[PDB]
Write a protein that binds this ligand. Structure first.
Ligand SMILES: Cc1ncc(COP(=O)(O)O)c(C)c1O
Ligand SMILES: Cc1ncc(COP(=O)(O)O)c(C)c1O
Ligand SMILES: NC[C@@H](N)CCC(=O)O
Lengths: 427, 402
């Protein structure tokens, strides 16, 4: 297994960029160091600058639900750019994508496009406070909503993987407004309200956690949060940047039947280009400028290229059988992995919902971020390297969920299992 | 002058999106409230959904310095997407654009790409505080750095050293640093007075504080190395955007090596992005920077923009309208006031009522200008000698009827 070309690129990259990457998540530090540099991607595969081919389960971290370089998305982009990539003025495509989002997500009646998930979470945070007139926010330990100052408190994703503390450079007076609590703990949430009458703007969370391993909500947890937020006139916000259009066309809120007041979107809406969005109850969105007093702008927001990519991606997802195929092949992958740990003598546990899954090296079960930190990170590191050599590409972290796409085949799944068998037997 | 199709589209939009737009200024509230919807852009022109053609002086707010839909940029983008648009892992192209940026911007020794000028400003503010361990920051009235906000932000008037000195004297050992637009564009075109930039450089060094340049709009337009290269003052950290994205969503922040080392994964300060550094944005940036390094680029922009700026100010003379303006390279200004304009306060003395009418008039003559008095104008390498003459001819007709 040669990675000569990647080490060269990476070695030179560390002199030009912090840690040689554009995002900490691409580090590989907690998994043995030395990342592989990609040359190209297509359907369910990725290729090294060294020629190695892999069955990809990261999917550029979520966007590639239709598979990499889907031919209908690329053809639509070629035709579109002939007309220019950015106008800086209104265009017909913004109206089209807007309607599609409103019909798809239950809580969204009015939307606003931005360029990333971080931009979407920052804006919804500022709108939560502006609408209720309150300053405090409640977030769960292990969840991640981009890097806006108030959110850098007990965050998951890279921070967890890298074992970092609440980031420095952010004034203690701003983080004082951020209240935390364990995931799946309704009682802890009631206490917070009890001790802070008239101060909580609302609650923000990942309807189904993906940034501290794959975690599903306990029975009654989402319904419970919806109940107590109504009691105290607080807002319930769903960050579906990762789950939107993946767990279901209308996201987790559609699948589990609970409707929030505001929800965020990203990744898949961009079909591969930089895009984000936030929308919800009309009476709330009315406060956004130029309709209202809360200012929020963006130069490239709503450019024709990105709109074109989002439109085409949602049309493909609307075809019948889409979400059923995703559940079918992902369940077979999840169950298989669990059966194999069992036979080789390894404690493990996991699960899947649609095309999202998780696999921990601990017997658990896993109900929160604390249970997850009990996984054998030493074993996971060896497991990850072994898979990489057998030609399977997994997220370089025990705290990241994995993904499948419409381009993954029954054969690709079987090949992944055969590879898991070989690796685990030698652990 | 028919705008039937635009009015219909914009009307349906207000029921789907806040105020019917993705960004405030696009709604035309400062000049009537009736925006025109674009269908396509090319070279120096733009086209209506009604078939109308305009000579564009907005250039999608900065990025289109090489002209709309440059054939060599579009061609490179077509070849690159056959390999995929996003990887989620390192790619060789990140190294390329990164080196080009380090070699072009004086103060940049190490860089991190992001997805907008806004993400860059968020990151740079947090990095300023983490490096010094202080919480106070100074910005100027009339300058824009995204919405990164909070009594930890002190403001002062642009072009006023004294007010800055005072702020340090009242908050000893609490100021992390100062951030500003080396040349203002987000509240009209405003150049810095003699010794103002030098003043700030020296005053920040005395207190072990940082100096930060937000060159999202000036970088690569005023000069290849931005304002810091043309005027000779070197900051500690700088933000970039617009042009390095060549038309796609891109941003960046860099500076001295030792300061950038705090950015994860190399350091404790956290900042990330799923789409950061994708091969499509990098390809657009590389090719845009290559076209700018061609001979006579910035000379040409100054040549045609001086004719335009001077002509305009002269036309206002003949027709009897108080006015003042100016230009540096391919960036110009023009206010309906005798001026001069040294800060945000002087700029507000403009006769908005007159600007609104002047705007519609030019729009009808086939000239598209920023829908606001507090926005700078732009020219590109695609604007020709004739395009400039036709614009001056149109301004004569409009100002002779105000
Ligand atoms: C749930 C969730 N919200 C927000 C973000 C940040 O979005 P982006 O990386 O596009 O800024 C991520 C990565 C995420 O997984
Ligand atoms: C000086 C300046 N700073 C920041 C920004 C924000 O960049 P963007 O709109 O890409 O977020 C702009 C547009 C700008 O001109
Ligand atoms: N770790 C969470 C992923 N969705 C991506 C993070 C990133 O690269 O910014």
């Amino acid at each position: 297994f040669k990675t000569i070309k990647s080490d060269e690129i990476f070695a030179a990259a560390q002199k030009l960029m912090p840690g040689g990457v554009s995002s900490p998540v691409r580090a590989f530090k907690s998994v043995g160091g030395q990342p592989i540099v990609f040359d190209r991607v297509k359907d369910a595969y990725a290729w090294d600058v060294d020629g190695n081919r892999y069955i990809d389960y990261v999917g550029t971290w979520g966007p590639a639900i239709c598979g990499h370089a889907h031919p209908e998305v690329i053809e639509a982009l070629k035709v579109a750019m002939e007309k220019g990539t950015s106008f800086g003025a209104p265009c017909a495509l913004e109206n089209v994508l807007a309607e599609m989002v409103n019909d798809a997500v239950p809580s969204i009646e009015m939307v606003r496009f931005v360029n990333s998930g971080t931009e979407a979470c920052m804006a919804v945070l500022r709108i939560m406070r502006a609408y209720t007139g309150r300053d405090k926010i409640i977030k769960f330990e292990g969840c991640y909503h981009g890097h806006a100052d108030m959110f850098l408190v007990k965050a998951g994703s890279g921070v967890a993987t890298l074992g970092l503390p609440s980031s420095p450079g952010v004034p203690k007076k701003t983080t004082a407004n951020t209240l935390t609590t364990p995931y799946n703990d309704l009682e802890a949430v009631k206490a917070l309200f009890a001790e802070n009458p008239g101060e909580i703007a609302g609650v923000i969370l990942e309807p189904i956690v993906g940034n501290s391993g794959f975690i599903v909500p306990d029975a009654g947890f989402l319904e419970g949060l919806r109940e107590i937020t109504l009691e105290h006139d607080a807002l319930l916000v769903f960050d579906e940047v990762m789950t939107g259009f993946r767990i279901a066309y209308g996201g987790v809120q559609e699948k589990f039947g609970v409707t929030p007041d505001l929800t965020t979107l990203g990744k898949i809406i961009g079909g591969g280009l930089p895009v984000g969005a936030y929308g919800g109850k009309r009476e709330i969105m009315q406060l956004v400028a130029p309709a209202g007093p809360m200012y929020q702008a963006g130069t490239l927001s709503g450019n024709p290229l990105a709109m074109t990519a989002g439109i085409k991606t949602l049309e493909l997802l609307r075809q019948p059988g889409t979400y059923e195929y995703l559940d079918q092949i992902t369940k077979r992958l999840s169950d298989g992995l669990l059966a194999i740990a069992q036979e080789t003598g390894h404690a493990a546990c996991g699960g899947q919902v649609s095309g999202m899954f998780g696999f921990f090296f601990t017997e658990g079960p896993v109900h929160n971020y604390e249970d997850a930190k009990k996984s054998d990170l030493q074993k996971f590191s060896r497991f990850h390297r072994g898979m990489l050599e057998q030609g399977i590409y997994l997220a370089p972290s025990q705290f990241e969920a994995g993904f499948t796409s419409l381009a993954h085949t029954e054969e690709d799944i079987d090949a992944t299992l055969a590879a898991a068998r070989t690796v685990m037997s030698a652990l």
